[PDB]
Every structure is written in C-alpha cells, then in structure tokens.
Amino acid sequence: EVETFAFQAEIAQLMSLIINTFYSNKEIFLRELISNSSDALDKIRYESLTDPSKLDSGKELHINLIPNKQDRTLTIVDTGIGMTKADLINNLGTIASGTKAFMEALQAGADISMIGQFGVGFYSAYLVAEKVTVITKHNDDEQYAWESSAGGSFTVRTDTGEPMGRGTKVILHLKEDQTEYLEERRIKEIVKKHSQFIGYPITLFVE
C-alpha cells in the first residue's frame, strides 16, 4: 500500500537548510504555494484550449485556503492540472529546478525569501509545517497522496480519501509555534501583501 523513497541528496540538503537556518520571515511560504497552484491552473487552462474535454473533471479554475484550528492544518487547494504518480515522484523529491543554484545563492548573499526565483519554492512549506501532505489528481491517473516530515524520506500511496475532480491539495500540518497562519486576519494580510494580483479567485474559508 505505501512506497517510501529517499529524497535525492541535494533536495535533502535543501530541506535541512530550510528547517535549520535561523530565519524569521516565514510568511513567504504562502506566496510560493499560491504561485505553484496558479501555474498548475495556467497549465490546465492552456491544454483545455485544444482539448475541452480536459475540463470534464471540472471547469472552475480557483484556489481555496482552508484553515483548521482543531487539526492545526492549513490546506491550499486548487483545480489545476494535478500530477500523475510518476509526476509526483519525479517533481517532489527524486530529482533536483534551481536547487543547486539557490543553495549557492544563499552563500553569495541571497536570503531564503528568494527561493521562488529558483523553482523550489514548494520547500519553503517546511518553514512553518512539521509535515506536508500533497494530494493530487491528474486526468491521466488515479488520485495519490505524497507525504513527508523531512528527515530524508517521503511516502507515496494511492489516496483513499475524498476523490477530488482534478487538481492538487497541499496540507500543512503546522509546527506548534506557527498557528498564526490559521488566523483569518494573518492569512488575509499575507495574501494582500504577496499574492494580490494572482489571476484566479483565492477563497479564504471561514471556521
């Protein structure tokens, strides 16, 4: 039922740097996740141009932000292109993106806020999350769950959870000390500051 993979060496090093570097400006993780969702939405919008039945799995292109204070989770959901199983394993840990360029940049005076220039911004989720779960559904495949609490490994399984139409869900199990990012005022503040021109509706769920 569950396959366990080692991250490629430089991805493991990147995650360790993100988890262990003292760096207080953590709110930047949201912008990076929201940009990755916007890109995934662009991709399905593009393909649906030449093949309209690609949206049989849902026409609405949007991003939802779902805080849950009981579970201590912040969930970013899109109806983007999604990923196949092979896409998931290839893009989320078995390959290196500006992974090397980012880590060399940090030693030449870049700072962690610049991670998105390097195409590895997804890993800034580890500034605020002790565990990340990615649930994804591509038109070409079944629904899969990737998961990692860092420490060098991740898992992939077929997802038995709620069948989504198509897209990706990023579930952040936040660290004990990072529950500010479940607060409605805080989330609105961050989206307004960093993601205010994203070209899809961003809906902040209430509790």
Ligand X SMILES: COc1cc(Cl)c(-c2nc(SCC(=O)N(C)C)nc3[nH]cc(C#N)c23)cc1OC
CB closer to ligand X, 162 vs 185: 162
- 139 labelled binding-site residue: no
Reference 94, options 8, 29, 17; nearest CA is 8
User: Which of 6, 9, 39, 161 contacts ligand X by CB under 6 A?
Assistant: 39
Shortest distance in whole angstroms from residue 153 CB to ligand X: 15
**Residue choice 36, 124, 133, 195 for contact with ligand X (CB under 6 A):** 36
Rounded to a whole number of angstroms, the minimum distance from the CB of residue 137 to ligand X is: 10
Phi, psi for 140 (deg, rounded to 5): -80, 0
Strands (E) across 83-206 are located at 129-137, 144-148, 153-158, 167-174, 202-204
Shortest distance, position 61 Cβ to ligand X, whole Å: 12
What's the rounded Cα separation, in Å, for the pair 106 and 123? 15
CA separation for the pair 43, 157 (Å, rounded): 24
18/126 Cα distance (integer angstroms): 7
Smallest separation, CB 136 to ligand X (Å) = 7
CA torsion, ordered 117, 121, 126, 131, to nearest 10 deg: -170
Rank residues 67 and 82 by Cβ distance to ligand X and give the closer one. Answer: 82
The reply, when asked if residue 51 is annotated as ligand binding, is no
Q: Does 122 help bind ligand X (rule: CB under 6 A)?
A: yes
Q: Which of 28, 127, 128, 134 binds ligand X (CB under 6 A)?
A: 134
The C-alpha atoms of residue 152 and residue 183 are separated, in whole angstroms, by 31
Amino acid at 50: T
Q: Nearest distance from residue 16's CB to ligand X, in Å?
A: 16
Pick the closest to residue 5 from 107, 156, 149, 106 (CA basis): 156
| Interface positions, 67-106, toward ligand X (CB under 6 A) | 78, 80-83, 87, 91-92
Q: Tell me whether residue 141 is annotated as binding.
A: no
Q: Which residues are annotated as a binding site for ATP?
A: 36, 78, 122
Residues that bind ligand X (CB under 6 A): 33, 36-37, 39-40, 43, 78, 80-83, 87, 91-92, 119, 122, 134, 168, 170
Q: Which residues are annotated as a binding site?
A: 36, 78, 122
